[PDB]
């Protein structure tokens, strides 16, 4: 039951930069006997299970590149990513493993990359889709920076907005850059009703909006 | 090789037990203390207890949070950690690993390997299969396909083109719940002198259901 704490909660540093984030316990991990402390650093990289860092605060683990360092002592710790990678993007957490083990809450790094625009591409309702009365529209908005963007979808001109889900991806652990989807679902007979189905994204990288679209008319 | 697997995560009612088991190879498992660790989505690292080594006579300790409520044991013949879990409650909802934990202590001391993972789901719902859509275009060196997976519950599907060997070029975004089903898609970028000529088929998983299908991406 030794309390862990991280800070800061995120941060957001561009490659080539040095990090530096804090793990403070509520109690001594220092053995006066071993003259060790019980803290370990581990990387959880974006939909990936954690790996193993450092432990006895300051030990790299094997494999680890050394530009991961971890100091402290009894309640005071610290892990430094001096020069920071794309591949450094992740949730770092603190454990100590003095009395049993017990995780810090992490501390979130994110990339600082260059301003990118989406790739977009558009999808009409799947045939196998429409067959079940249902209709999907689908939108890709791929590799682009940062993350907030505004998506609207233009049915015949209007923007909807009815029936749209959303999702991003986490930042890319290679160009450091988010993908997201925007997808519209409309019953089939609403689908044929319309025809121009336009999405539309206008984000930091450009005044113009970034579109793509079909006629169903078309298709 | 190193190599940990979790198995017997699902959808779980409220009140409900659980055996998760955790094979293992690659290493002299009687060796080493075993933990388990959960993540509940969006939530930090929680360790639930660990079960020591043979010098150690394999004890078993526990975090507070699960203790007298889940059970660890290991089969040393055959190299496998198990929970048991009991009365689970939402809060129980999670990511569970297992992982290699510490051998001597003058070595230390940490995690040194992980699993995937398995994830459970303590609710009410009932666990509804997938339809799986291909999305296809309806022009430039470069073509964007995908794959509409929709609800679908609980979590996880998984989803993979190719087999696994299209990983670059994809990305498959998180499920977004909507009325207790969820909806997921995922995307490959390949080069359009490469499609439609070689097949770009997703492969969706949803082993709660029991579903398993793969979808070609066929144009027009
Ligand atoms: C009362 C302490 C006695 O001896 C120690 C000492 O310096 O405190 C600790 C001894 O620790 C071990 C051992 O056989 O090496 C290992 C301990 O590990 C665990 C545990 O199993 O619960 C897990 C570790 O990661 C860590 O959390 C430790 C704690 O730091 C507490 O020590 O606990 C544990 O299994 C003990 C066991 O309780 C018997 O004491 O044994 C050992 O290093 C001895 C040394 O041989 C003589 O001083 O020092």
């Known amino acids: 039951d030794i309390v862990m704490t991280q800070s800061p909660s995120s941060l957001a540093v561009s490659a080539g930069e040095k990090v530096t984030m804090s793990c403070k316990s509520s109690?001594?991990?220092?053995?006066?006997?071993?003259?060790?402390?019980?803290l370990a650093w581990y990387q959880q990289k974006p939909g990936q299970s954690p790996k193993l860092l450092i432990f006895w605060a300051s030990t790299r683990e094997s494999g680890v590149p050394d530009r991961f360092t971890g100091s402290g002592s009894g309640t005071d710790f610290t892990l430094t990513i001096s020069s920071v990678q794309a591949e450094d993007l992740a949730v770092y957490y603190c454990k100590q493993s003095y009395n049993l083990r017990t995780f810090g809450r992490g501390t979130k790094l994110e990339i600082k990359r260059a301003d990118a625009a989406p790739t977009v591409s558009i999808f009409p309702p799947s045939s196998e889709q429409l067959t079940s009365g249902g209709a999907s529209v689908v939108c890709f908005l791929n590799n682009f920076y940062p993350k907030d963007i505004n998506v609207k979808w233009k049915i015949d001109g209007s923007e909807r907005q009815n029936g749209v889900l959303n999702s991003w991806t986490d930042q890319d652990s290679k160009d450091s850059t988010y993908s997201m989807s925007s997808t519209l679902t409309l019953t089939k007979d609403e689908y044929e009703r319309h025809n121009s189905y336009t999405c539309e994204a206008t984000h930091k990288t450009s005044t113009s909006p970034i579109v793509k679209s079909f006629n169903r008319n078309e298709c | 090789e190193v190599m940990l697997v979790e198995s017997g995560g699902g959808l779980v009612q409220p009140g409900g037990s659980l055996r998760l088991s955790c094979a293992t190879s690659?290493?002299?498992?009687?060796?080493?203390?075993m933990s388990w660790v959960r993540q509940p989505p969006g939530k930090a690292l929680e360790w639930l207890g660990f079960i020591r080594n043979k010098v150690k006579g394999y004890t078993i300790d526990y975090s507070a949070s699960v203790k007298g409520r889940f059970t660890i044991s290991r089969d040393n013949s055959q190299s496998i950690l198990y929970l048991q879990m009991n009365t689970l409650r939402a809060e129980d909802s999670a990511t569970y690993y297992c992982?290699?934990?510490?051998?001597?202590?003058?070595?230390?001391?940490?995690?040194?390997?992980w699993g995937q993972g398995t994830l459970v789901t303590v609710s009410a719902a009932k666990t509804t299969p997938p339809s799986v859509y291909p999305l296809a275009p309806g022009t430039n060196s470069m073509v964007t396909l995908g794959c509409l997976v929709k609800g679908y519950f609980p979590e996880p599907v998984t989803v993979t083109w190719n087999s696994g060997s299209l990983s670059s070029g994809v990305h498959t975004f998180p499920a977004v719940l909507q009325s207790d089903l969820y909806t997921l898609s995922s995307s490959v970028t390949v080069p359009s002198s490469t499609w439609p000529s070689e097949t770009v088929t997703c492969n969706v998983a949803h082993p709660a259901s029991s579903t398993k299908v793969d979808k070609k991406i066929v144009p027009r």
């Open positions: 109690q001594s991990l220092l053995n006066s006997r071993t003259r060790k402390n019980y």
């Open positions: 690659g290493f002299t498992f009687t060796d080493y203390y």
């Open positions: 992982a290699r934990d510490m051998r001597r202590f003058d070595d230390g001391d940490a995690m040194d390997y």
